[PDB]
Amino acid sequence: SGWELQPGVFLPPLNKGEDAIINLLRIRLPDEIFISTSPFGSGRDAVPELVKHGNVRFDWVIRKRRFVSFFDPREYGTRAIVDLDQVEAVDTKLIAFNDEQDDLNDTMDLLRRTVERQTATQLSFLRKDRLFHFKAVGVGKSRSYRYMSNVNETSAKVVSAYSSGYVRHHAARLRFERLADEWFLVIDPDFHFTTDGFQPHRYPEALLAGKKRLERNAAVRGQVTMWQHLLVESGKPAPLLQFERLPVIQLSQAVPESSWNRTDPRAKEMEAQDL
C-alpha cells in the first residue's frame, strides 16, 4: 500500500582492508648544489653565449642574475654564463629546503630540467601544458615500451599511430611536491596527440574527448606504474637524481569489487575501452 519504504540497506566495505599505490616518487637529490651570480638576467638570455661552446647542457637555472645547477658549472660551457669568482658548492638544503618562494621556484625549475635531460632517450618535453610525452621514432610509426610491473614484465604501445591520420603518445605531467623535508615527483598521466609522430595536431578537441573514456582506475594505475619504472631506471657521469618508490598505502576498508561486479549494472563502465 502506497510507496514502499526501502530499508536503506547496502553491502558495507570489506573489513579486511586493501592496499593502494600513490603516484609519488621520493627524489634523492645530490648533497651539494652549485650557485653563482650571472651577468644574464634569465636563462633564455644566456643561451646564445652558452651555445658558442661544446657539450651543451640545459639542466640549470638563471633567475634574477642567480645561477643554480647540480653539476659543477666550471666544467661546462656554463663557465661562460656565470661570474666565475662567485661559484660555490653549498649544502643542497640551503636552496631546496627553505621558506623562500624564489628558492622553491628555482628548485622546481632545476628539478624539471634535470628530469628532462635524464629522460631524453624516451621522452620529449612540451613547454605548453608542461607535458612530458614518449617521443616517436619514425613518421607515422608506432612503438612500444617494456617495463616491470611488480615482478612481471609488461609493455605498452606508448606511441600509437592510426590511419584511415593521428598518433597518440603516452604522456604525463611530472610535478614536484615538497612534503616535510623531502622532495617528491608526482606522476599525472595524460596523452599527447600529433598528426604523424611530430607535428602537433592542428585541433586537439576532437581527440580530447576520447581521452576521457580512458580515465578509469585500472588504466591510470597501470600508467603510473609504467612511469615509475621509467623514472626509477633513469637514475641508475652518473645521473644526478635517483627516484624511490614509496611503500603501498594501507586502507582499513576495501571496496567490495567482486560483489559489485555481480550486483552493479554499471560495473563494465568502470573499465576503460580503448577505441
Partner: protein, 463 residues
C-alpha cells in the same frame, strides 16, 4: 603516510532523526522543523505550453514516480508523492494569479535578434520585468519557476569573457528581488542555463522530481536537514573567501565571502578590491582588507543566528598570503570566537592513490601526507552500491595553516561534511565543500553588479 577511511557524514532530520542520505532521511523523518499547514507558493513564468507542462509535472510528482533503475534503488529512488507520504511535509502549489506567460510574439522577438549579446539583454530585460511584477503584485510567490520554451533556451544558451551569460545576467538584474528563481528545461524539468546545452539533447524522472522539489524547498527558505555536530553546544561556522574579476574598468578583482552554517544556509558578502601579485593575476587581500571582510562576515552571521559559533573555519582555494593570515587573525582575535582554522583547499592537485581494480577508492578516503591531507570527496559510495560517476575522481588536497587550532583529521572530516550541503541535487557525493562551491556561482553573478552597489547577503538569490 597514514590513511583513514572516514564514515559517510551523518545528517540530522526531523525530531532528531539521523541518516547519511537526504532522500531516505526525509522519507524516514521529514525535514528539520516543519510547521502544520506548511505550503510553498510557486509562481511560474513560461509560455501557454510550458506552463501547462509544469502543471502536469507537479500533478504527476504529487501522485508519485517509480524508480527507473530498481537494481540501484538507493541511488535511483521512487518519488513517494506529495500526499500522505510527502517527504517534505510541505504542499507545493501554484496559486491562481501567480503565473505570467511569455507570448509567441515575445519569443519570436528574442529569437529574431541576430546578435547574441543583444538577444540576451532583450530577454533579461523582459523576464526581469515579469519577475518584478510577479513579486510586486498580489500573488505572493515564495519561489518562481522560469520554464522557457526549448527554442528560447536554444537561443540563449550555447552548446558544447567574450559573450553574455543569460543566467548570470538575469540573476544579477534580479538580485534585489526577495523571491528566488529556478530555471528549468520544460521537458525533463532539470536545471537549464547553468551549463552549456548538448546540441543533440535527447527514466530519471523520479530523481528529477526529488531534485526540483528539494531546490524549491531550499529556495523557499526551509531547511531539510542539518550537519550532525560532534557537540550540540559546539556550533561551527564555515567562511569561504573567494575572488572574481571584473570585465570592465581596469579589470580589478573583488573579494567575496561565503559564510555557511550547519543548516546549509549561506550569507554572501562582497569585500574590498583585491591586490594582485603579477600582471593583474593571483588576487590577494592586504591585512586591512582581510580583517574587514572577516569582520563584515562575522557581523552578518551574528545578525542571522541566535548563537555565536564556538569555532570558525576559513577556506580559500589559493594559499593564504602572510598578510591575509595576519588580517584574519586580527578579526578572529577581536571576535572572541574561541577556536579558528584556516585551510587552503587545493582543487587541482596532481596527487592521487590507486587501488587495484576497476572501481576507485571509497569516498571518505583520506591520506595524511605530512601536514597535507589528501581527501576523496568523490569515489566509490557503499550506500549507492557503485561509483556514481565515470571518469576517475581526483581528490582535494587540504593544507591547514599553522595558525589553525584543529588537527588535519578534524578539518578533513569537516570538509567532507560540507560537501553534503547541496542546493543543486539530492545526490550527496559532491566534490567541493559548500563555501568553496558557492564562490564560483556568486562570482559569475556579482561581476554584473557594479562594485560599490550593496548586494543581498541571502545566498538563495544566487542559487
Amino acid at each position: 603516510f597514514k590513511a583513514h577511511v572516514f564514515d559517510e557524514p551523518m545528517l540530522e532530520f526531523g525530531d532528531g532523526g539521523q541518516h547519511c542520505d537526504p532522500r531516505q532521511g526525509l522519507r524516514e523523518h521529514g525535514p528539520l522543523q516543519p510547521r502544520s499547514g506548511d505550503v510553498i507558493r510557486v509562481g511560474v513564468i513560461g509560455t501557454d505550453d510550458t506552463v501547462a507542462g509544469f502543471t502536469e509535472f507537479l500533478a504527476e510528482t504529487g501522485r508519485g514516480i517509480e524508480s527507473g533503475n530498481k537494481q540501484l534503488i538507493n541511488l535511483n529512488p521512487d518519488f513517494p508523492g506529495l500526499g500522505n507520504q510527502n517527504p517534505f511535509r510541505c504542499k507545493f502549489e501554484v496559486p491562481d494569479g501567480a503565473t505570467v506567460t511569455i507570448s509567441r510574439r515575445q519569443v519570436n522577438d528574442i529569437t529574431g535578434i541576430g546578435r547574441h549579446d543583444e538577444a540576451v539583454r532583450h530577454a533579461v530585460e523582459l523576464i526581469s520585468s515579469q519577475l518584478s511584477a510577479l513579486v510586486e503584485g498580489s500573488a505572493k510567490p515564495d519561489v518562481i519557476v522560469l520554464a522557457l520554451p526549448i527554442p528560447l533556451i536554444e537561443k540563449l544558451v550555447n552548446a558544447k569573457g567574450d559573450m553574455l551569460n543569460f543566467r548570470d545576467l538575469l540573476k544579477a538584474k534580479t538580485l534585489h528581488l526577495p523571491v528566488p528563481t529556478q530555471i528549468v528545461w520544460p521537458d525533463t524539468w532539470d536545471d537549464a542555463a547553468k551549463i552549456p546545452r548538448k546540441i543533440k539533447r535527447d527514466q530519471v524522472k523520479a530523481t528529477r522530481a526529488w531534485n526540483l522539489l528539494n531546490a524549491l524547498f531550499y529556495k523557499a527558505g526551509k531547511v531539510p536537514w542539518r550537519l550532525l555536530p560532534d557537540q550540540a553546544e559546539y556550533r561551527t561556522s564555515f567562511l569561504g573567501i573567494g575572488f572574481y574579476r571584473d570585465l570592465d574598468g581596469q579589470q580589478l578583482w573583488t573579494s567575496t565571502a561565503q559564510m555557511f552554517d550547519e543548516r546549509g544556509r549561506g550569507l554572501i558578502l562582497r569585500g574590498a578590491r583585491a591586490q594582485t601579485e603579477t600582471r593583474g593575476r593571483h588576487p590577494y587581500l592586504t591585512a586591512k582588507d582581510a580583517e574587514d571582510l572577516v569582520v563584515q562576515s562575522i557581523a552578518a552571521y551574528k545578525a542571522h543566528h541566535r548563537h555565536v559559533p564556538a569555532r570558525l573555519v576559513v577556506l580559500k582555494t589559493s594559499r593564504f598570503r602572510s598578510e591575509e593570515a595576519e588580517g584574519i587573525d586580527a578579526a578572529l582575535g577581536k571576535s572572541g570566537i574561541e577556536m579558528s582554522d584556516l585551510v587552503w583547499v587545493q582543487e587541482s592537485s596532481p596527487i592521487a592513490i590507486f587501488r587495484d581494480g576497476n572501481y576507485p577508492v571509497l569516498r571518505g578516503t583520506f591520506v595524511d601526507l605530512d601536514g597535507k591531507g589528501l581527501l576523496y570527496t568523490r569515489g566509490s559510495v557503499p550506500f549507492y552500491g557503485t561509483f556514481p560517476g565515470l571518469r576517475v575522481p581526483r581528490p582535494l588536497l587540504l593544507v591547514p595553516h599553522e595558525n589553525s587550532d584543529s588537527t588535519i583529521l578534524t578539518l578533513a572530516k569537516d570538509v567532507l561534511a560540507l560537501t553534503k550541503v547541496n542546493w543543486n541535487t539530492t545526490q550527496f557525493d559532491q566534490k567541493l565543500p559548500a563555501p568553496i562551491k558557492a564562490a564560483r556561482e556568486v562570482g559569475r553573478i556579482l561581476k554584473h553588479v557594479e562594485f560599490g552597489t550593496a548586494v543581498s547577503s541571502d545566498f538563495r538569490r544566487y542559487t
